[PDB]
């Protein structure tokens, strides 16, 4: 009996996308809070730029 | 007696976000949040219609009102909305099971809302959208593109 | 009281995965409890009773603990047994029968830990099975007592049989005799599938009896249950046992509510996982124990999806099992459970997504196999379960980029469109489009499936084309469109409508033109339609002030938005909420000849159930307001130790009566229309010599069954009216069977 | 093999390479019945794999050399003793991985776990583990490689998040960039990951922490060379090819880079440009690509025409040297189609 891996492949792609998103917010200056989950954005860098 | 472990409800706990434009102290805002029936929904694609939000959030109960977030200047959808239920139980169910799932292939975030007021559906960023949109430096096709502060 | 919280945390911590072995942690906890016993004795007893009641999944972990304590303190063991008996009495008095079965199981296990003498347990079970000899009591009572006796056997059966063989044989003979004469009317109503192959959906007591018989044949030997107390066999052999006081089951009172009967959900067998551990058979006690423990784990952590998934994956067993298959089957058993799932439906979708995320290697493939198996067994699936399947599958696809192997279902293309498989495919595609746009759904499926894709959700206007010049009211329709575009108020709309020619206090053409124009001009979004309805509330109330007016308003609204079922649903809901129509009008419209072609579609029944839910919520809110007012009046009277308050209470009471009357009338109308249409179909089929069983008949009868199942608690109040007026003996047996099954559900 | 001596380890590694090559030649397939010799040697092949992963040599040698004129230049040694050592170790580990990839993946995962939990945490150990991870690029199938690399990158990002201090974050980020730059097939498969990596490199190019800018430029040129064809075409979800986006913001990307890093960046962009098959679009890209150097070139030429004495001004000479170095790097990266730029200044 064959194995249906369509959702497994989709989940692997989603995991890759999540890792890419995590890499996007990678930094080397300070820690960024993850309290907003998928809405997280670099607000410290934004504050630095605004000044 | 009851068991503390079985009482865990971490998914419906107050988040760290407090509306800075709320006309009241932190205690009053927390009191309103604890008994609120409204949820702020964020991280929506700019092409997410109110019908899709209705379909997704009616799985948790009967929806009273949906207020789509809009550009302050352009008056166009800017990736967030408010969903008000008739009962707190439906809002709790949405926070438990709709939070962190996919709408238009995007992980949407739900938060407790102290209550909708006129003008709260407009982004508070300088460009008229959400503050995160102007403060983000990545590229997002579903949210316009690069951040308004970067703009390529 | 930080000491009490620390003790509770210590007691609840045991059993969770830790560096130390289970035996070492259990011994240490027992020693600590003994050390602190003299002070916090009552707190410890209460905590142990609470965990026995609320954590069935860790049953053997805690009984053993008690045994260890019983080894160090005979008095503590006796007091704990007394407290447990008292708690069981309270639970039975409060109609909490699930907690009662958990406590009974705990006592049965305690027998194994040498805390309770076997003869006392045998006497208690003799009383339990003697409850089946009573007279003029409902079958649900006897069923629950037999179930409480049998479901504890997996744990204490070997001890009871090796100690008291003759008594156990007598009890088994009594149980078998009772089961042989049980009524099985409720089975067809509660069966997810009516096909005997490949897995019969068996009654829960019959399945339990078969499993217990198999266990008896295998020398009362089972190879799944975890039994930590064996590691302390030396310690527990020197412990002195206690005797349970003679237990008298509470008599059957009028205000006694018993659990409803169940049917076991079965879809998997060992051949579905040939490579992994051999799956326990359907008639094996291991399957029963695994399913019970998984259900209990879901029950304990339903609020927290991540914790629930972690507990499910880390479920410990004595021997390796195909855990993923068991978890999937348990989740789908809960989702498809009739009458209703234990928890909200979306919780199961989210939990399955979490499980797939936690075990990406294997769980998604098992889920795809289960989905294919469910699809292949849709011919006999129950319509309620088919709807739950459609909703879960569409929501799941929405979370996985709408990716599916549609080609595997190509057979659905060659079948009659009304068949369960093409109908399921169409409904799934419609629900997927509801979560996306039309073009995406058109793209994801193969071109050969294009015929099954949803139609474009575009409005239909009667006064848009040039050829409509001859249609009545065309000029008035144009004037109304101009007035709406110019922000005309209610008076202007009334003046414009006054020119509509009346064919004969109810003008069908006037309502038609007004509704068509207003809906067409607000067809941009749901919010625009709601604003339009709110702004012209006065016009709607004035025009559709009669029953015929409401029916025509609904007819015209359907005609405008025929291609957008979601719009129809939201509009009907809003109209009911703002009082444009009433639940009776919607119920009559559902069965009207205009919706005959869309009768079997999901959105019709979604609208009907939403209306019923709104009526129920209104009644509940009114009753709650009356109760609050009465409590406030009583408190004020007590504090003082009024005429306006009494008048307000009287007005609220008559409002409650009116709401109850409206709810009863709604249910009566629904049942009347169901009976009428079913009788018409049956008479036509008999006259033409056609088979009664057709897709339409299946859908209609199962929708009547769903109406009975969803609101059985409310419909119980109308038993006399339903029996005397609607569901009489003269009715055709096909229709009367549904009512008989509903009655047997709790009789 | 555990002795900390280069020559003794070289002898031992010569034997290990011979053994791995012989076993691979016997049967290159992974874990049919196991080959006889492989069956004999199975009990210790995992020990050899652990030795290879635990003592991986530095992949490249970088030397700071003063030129004839006094220019300080970073140069990569081509074929030295240490590079040969790394090549032999990489070949041995690749043979062993081809024998079975599950064991190599398990060893790497265990090393990464021990790095994360702090038991075996150190910059040297992390560098060695990342060199070992990079060395086996292409030794496993695309799907297994994708899964393993996703797991490794997730764990490394978590480690970077958990670790505190600028130095530790810089080390972990450099290791992540090195690993991703060693797996061009992974970046080619996923466009979002490639774009995120490139944007992260551009962000690092503004980082003044020592060594970060050089690492970013090296990784950028490596990715540009290996994935050149993915910067000129239009990618799904994009409006214009990434080359146009880079060229538009080239001024803001290199504002903090040093002249040598600027030359490296220009060479990488030229590698990207040279992949454009269309002649007209390629010419337009080349014209838009040399605009910033050409502005300074034209200004200097006009100043010289007005007064040749400006050519005796040292600053003008430094600017001319920088412009010509940029042109040389661009010519090397682009090739024949660079003629137009040359024709413009010849
Ligand atoms: O300095 C700003 C921002 O950078 C900073 N910030 C951002 N992220 C953090 C974290 N993680 N920790 C501490 N500080 C952080 O806070 C300042 C404001 O940013 P932000 O709160 O993101 O913007 P704001 O919410 O004020 O504006 P906008 O989103 O445009 O408001 C539009 C509309 O939406 C409501 N709303 C937004 N968000 C994110 C909400 C939320 O999380 N919960 C609720 N209930 N409502 C939210 C706004 O209040 C408006 O109603």
Numbering used by the authors:
A (entry chain P): 112 to 162
B (entry chain D): 4 to 155
C (entry chain C): 25 to 528, 538 to 674, 685 to 790
D (entry chain A): 358 to 388, 400 to 714
What does the literature reporting this entry say, word for word?
During early RNA polymerase II (Pol II) transcription, nascent transcripts acquire an m7G-cap at their 5′ end, which is rapidly bound by the nuclear cap-binding complex (CBC) composed of CBP80 (also known as NCBP1) and CBP20 (NCBP2). Additional control of this process involves the nuclear phosphorylation by casein kinase 2 (CK2) of multiple serines in the phosphorylation site cluster 2 (ST2) of PHAX, which is essential for stable complex formation and export. Here we present the cryo-electron microscopy structure of the human snRNA export complex comprising phosphorylated PHAX, CBC, CRM1–RanGTP and capped RNA.
The cryo-EM map covers all the complex components with CBC and the CRM1–RanGTP forming two lobes, each adopting essentially the same structures. The W118-containing PHAX helix is extended to include the PHAX NES, which binds to CRM1, thus rigidly bridging the RNA-binding CBC to the export factor. The downstream segment of PHAX (residues 140–162) is also structured, forming contacts with both CBP20 and the RNA cap structure. Only the cap structure of the RNA is well-defined, indicating flexibility of the rest of the RNA molecule. While V130, L134, L137 and M139 bind CRM1 in a canonical way, the first residue of the PHAX NES sequence (Φ0) is a conserved glutamine (Q127) rather than a hydrophobic residue. CBC and CRM1 also directly interact via several hydrogen bonds between Y142 and Y149 of CBP20 and K563, G605 and E613 of HEAT repeats 12 and 13 of CRM1. However, we found that conserved E150 of PHAX inserts into the cap-binding site, forming hydrogen bonds with R112 and Y43 of CBP20.
